[PDB]
Amino acid sequence: SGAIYVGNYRVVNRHLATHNDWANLVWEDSSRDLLVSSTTAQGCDTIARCDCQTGVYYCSSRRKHYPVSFSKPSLIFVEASEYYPARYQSHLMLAVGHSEPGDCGGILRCQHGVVGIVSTGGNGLVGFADVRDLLWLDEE
Numbered sequence: 001s002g003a004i005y006v007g008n009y010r011v012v013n014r015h016l017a018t019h020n021d022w023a024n025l026v027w028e029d030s031s032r033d034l035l036v037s038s039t040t041a042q043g044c045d046t047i048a049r050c051d052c053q054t055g056v057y058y059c060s061s062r063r064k065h066y067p068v069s070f071s072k073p074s075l076i077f078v079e080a081s082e083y084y085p086a087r088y089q090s091h092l093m094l095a096v097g098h099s100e101p102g103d104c105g106g107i108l109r110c111q112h113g114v115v116g117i118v119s120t121g122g123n124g125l126v127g128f129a130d131v132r133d134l135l136w137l138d139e140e
């Protein structure tokens with residue numbers, strides 16, 4: 001589990017979004033596994049605005065923060081899960097690393113701030129949904 005809190009926005013895995021998130025929906029994309037909802041309280045996270053391909057992510061299944069090299073956001077074939085059929089997920093970044101059930105929502109960060117959230121895993125890889133292209137998270 002996990003979310004990003006920036007301005008009056010909450011960013012979660014679409015597949016983990018709550019009743020309150022869907023009621024207070026700003027924006028969602030099934031193909032990216034993202035949902036953004038409105039919040040009452042101001043958040044403290046900063047979104048990275050960069051093309052960094054190195055960072056640190058939190059892995060809840062190991063209680064550890066791993067330094068990683070990750071691919072640029074791309075269309076990536078993702079095997080069927082309990083949440084989606086086998087499909088192309090867009091704006092996805094891959095790294096060699098641990099990702100198991102309960103790891104989705106872990107934050108990936110670089111020197112500039114939040115890059116994205118754990119969205120996929122298996123076969124010794126971890127996939128992260130990029131948020132750096134969502135410039136509107138910084139305003140309104």
Ligand SMILES: COc1ccc(Cl)c2c1C(=O)C(=O)N2
Binds near residue numbers: 083084105122
């Ligand atoms: C599409 O959702 C997933 C696919 C693969 C893996 Cl390992 C996952 C998830 C999660 O939600 C999670 O916590 N671990």
Ligand SMILES: [Zn+2]
Binds near residue numbers: 048049050051052112
């Ligand atoms: Zn960066």
